[PDB]
Amino acid sequence: MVLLAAAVCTKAGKAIVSRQFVEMTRTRIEGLLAAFPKLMNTGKQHTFVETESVRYVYQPMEKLYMVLITTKNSNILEDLETLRLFSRVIPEYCRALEENEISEHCFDLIFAFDEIVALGYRENVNLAQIRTFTEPPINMESVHMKIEEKITLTCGRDGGLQNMELHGMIMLRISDDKFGRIRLHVENEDKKGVQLQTHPNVDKKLFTAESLIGLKNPEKSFPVNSDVGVLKWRLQTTEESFIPLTINCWPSESGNGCDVNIEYELQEDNLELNDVVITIPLPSGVGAPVIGEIDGEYRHDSRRNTLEWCLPVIDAKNKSGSLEFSIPGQPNDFFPVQVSFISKKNYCNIQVTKVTQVDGNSPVRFSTETTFLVDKYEIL
């Protein structure tokens, strides 16, 4: 509200008809209208006159006052304009102003008042419209980058990629004096899946060729979450991720028994994985297994109904086993084998090409390390 009430008055000493938009001025309406409009609103034949700290705008018609009252105001033109439009609407209802005829068309006038001024804000009306209603240490300066990633895979016996996805972040720990600007350059990523998050203080640079990211690092360790892919993302292992292991499973029906050969393949021979385990499941009518493996230890476990092969570290390697089964029922479909592994590379293929720091002399990138871990890695 800005407009307390819109009121038609008789200077008989009473508000003849009046409108209270929201319950506030009930009885209050009559006393104001009754005292002030009698004196011509205390006017001198001026449309604006203010008395008892209430702005009264008016027009005399006979012994009657058509009155607008406000005690606040948004604009000069507006207060007059609602009164004016009211003055087009009032003779349509009452043939000028006159207390008895005003009284009889309380409903008409009152309805117009609600329509004209709604919650004290001056809407507009017109006679046709009315009708529808009534119808420093920099010697120390060093930087370290750690890329930690987990890869997930589902693959068929055929070696179908199925779905895969890599999750990771690159954490940076930096001891640098001053506030140095750093630019990070990384390889370009694609992702069938989606997710990338950027740390604040990461800026994106647009270059004609190559992509670049720059930022002032927080000191100590923080998730870079740089721009580009980001240094906090879920990339799809599917999108160009390498799966460190591929398992080729050859089950064989020895007849009564079953012979299973499991083939494991690693990436470049030079790289070695650690904490590798292959879980090869077995059928319920187990008998006992005989397993042979060149490297690591392998053990059959009943209960689990799985044969688990563990290898501390592997350039790459394979295992074989023969199973004995009582044969109840018919043949059983195989359940997928899962693997756990650790690799000193990221198989999201994130590479830190270059991180150049400014604001000072060359810092030493003492070390960049990559920890790759298996997520749900399943192959049938």
From Swiss-Prot:
Pfam families given in the database record: Adap_comp_sub, Clat_adaptor_s
Q: Does the keyword Protein transport apply?
A: yes
| Record localization | Cytoplasm; Golgi apparatus membrane; Cytoplasmic vesicle, COPI-coated vesicle membrane
Q: Which GO terms describe its cellular component?
A: COPI vesicle coat; COPI-coated vesicle; endoplasmic reticulum; Golgi apparatus; Golgi membrane
Which InterPro entries has this protein been placed in?
A: AP2_Mu_C_sf, AP_mu_sigma_su, Coatomer_dsu, Longin-like_dom_sf, MHD
Give the matching Gene3D superfamilies: 3.30.450.60, Mu homology domain, subdomain B
User: Which residues are annotated with the PTM Phosphoserine?
Assistant: 362
Q: Where is the MHD domain?
A: 140-380
Q: Identify residues that carry N6-acetyllysine.
A: 178, 220
Where primarily located? cytoplasm
Keywords, comma-separated and alphabetical: Acetylation, Cytoplasm, Cytoplasmic vesicle, ER-Golgi transport, Golgi apparatus, Membrane, Phosphoprotein, Protein transport, Transport
Any GO BP annotation:
establishment of localization in cell
Identify the CDD domains for this entry. AP_delta-COPI_MHD (cd09254), Delta_COP_N (cd14830)
> Is-annotated flag, keyword Aminoacyl-tRNA synthetase?
no
- Membrane topology category: Peripheral membrane protein
Domain of life, per lineage = Eukaryota
What this protein is reported to do is described as: The coatomer is a cytosolic protein complex that binds to dilysine motifs and reversibly associates with Golgi non-clathrin-coated vesicles, which further mediate biosynthetic protein transport from the ER, via the Golgi up to the trans Golgi network. Coatomer complex is required for budding from Golgi membranes, and is essential for the retrograde Golgi-to-ER transport of dilysine-tagged proteins.
Q: What family does this chain come from, according to its entry?
A: Belongs to the adaptor complexes medium subunit family. Delta-COP subfamily.
Quaternary form? Answer: Oligomeric complex that consists of at least the alpha, beta, beta', gamma, delta, epsilon and zeta subunits.
This protein's name: Coatomer subunit delta
